[model samples]
Target: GAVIACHTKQEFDTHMANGKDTGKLVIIDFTASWCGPCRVIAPVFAEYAKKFPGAIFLKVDVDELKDVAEAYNVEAMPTFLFIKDGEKVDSVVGGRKDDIHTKIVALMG
Candidate 1:
């Protein structure tokens, strides 16, 4: 299946509430089109999604989905939220490549 795009607070909430039972962790990528760091990290996320096919990857534009960003207390672009069993277990900010993979693997496990 194709990766899902989460563009609104309601959509994100619905997914979080209903989609975690499949044993697939939800990875929310909080990004903005104009953010250089967000763009830089996009492909790394894409590659990891391919590697971990059981996980759910959703991209939320910080500019378009301000409420979702605020709800998660996101203060920077390319922030990643790792959700499991309908709750956020971990969140990472900035664009460090190694930290991203390590955090996700650690959280999902």
Candidate 2:
């Protein structure tokens, strides 16, 4: 419930638009289910969304939605985008929990 899953390019666009509409910082987690590290960080990502309602959390499965993944240039698993005003301000690649968390906090501020 904490993470919003975008399965299509339209869905992803809507979520991004909603984030901009609500003035919420959008954090998109580009991940693949087959990836072990992606599975590992999934919960941590959800917890962050639950813990910080100030931002919008989104999950995009690279396999399920290739268009969105390619558009974002997400070549790695668990690529996190910290966006504000529909523009990417920062990012974190991989499943490094601390780095992701720190980046989120930094984006929130």
Candidate 3:
């Protein structure tokens, strides 16, 4: 699926529920509008969504959903979390394209 720009907390939960049931890996990009590093990886993340149908890509704006970000322990502008079976298995911070890609592919396995 394409990158889901979750606008509300409820919206995020709905997707997560489906992922839990379907057993697809969930890749969440915790971001902020004012963050430059986040902008750098946004497009790459979009491409990954298209290329990897085995995973779910999500974008959560920290400012828009502070509680959600806090729940995931996201403190950086562009934190990437790999969620499997409703649990966070791994995470990556910053906009390192290769690092993010590596984690996604590895976790999808």
Highest-lDDT candidate: 3
Per-residue alpha-carbon lDDT of candidate 1 for residues 42-99, written as tens digits (9 for 90 to 100): 8888888887777788889988888778988998778988888877888889887898
Prediction-by-prediction clash tally:
0, 0, 0
Candidates ranked by TM-score, best first? 3, 2, 1
- Model 1's TM-score against the true structure: 0.87
Model 2, span 1-109: residue lDDT tens: 3799998888889989999998888999999889999999998999998988888899999999888888889978889988899898998999888998888787777
* Regions of candidate 3 where Cα sits further than 4 Å from its true position: none
> What TM-score goes with each of the models?
0.87, 0.94, 0.96
Winner of 1 and 2 under lDDT: 2
Judging by TM-score against the true structure, name the best candidate: 3
Model 3 per-residue lDDT tens digits across residues 75-106: 77799998899899999989889998898888
- In the predicted model 3, the residue pairs found to clash are none
The regions of model 1 sitting more than 4 angstroms off are: none
Q: Residue 7 error for model 2, in Å?
A: 1.3
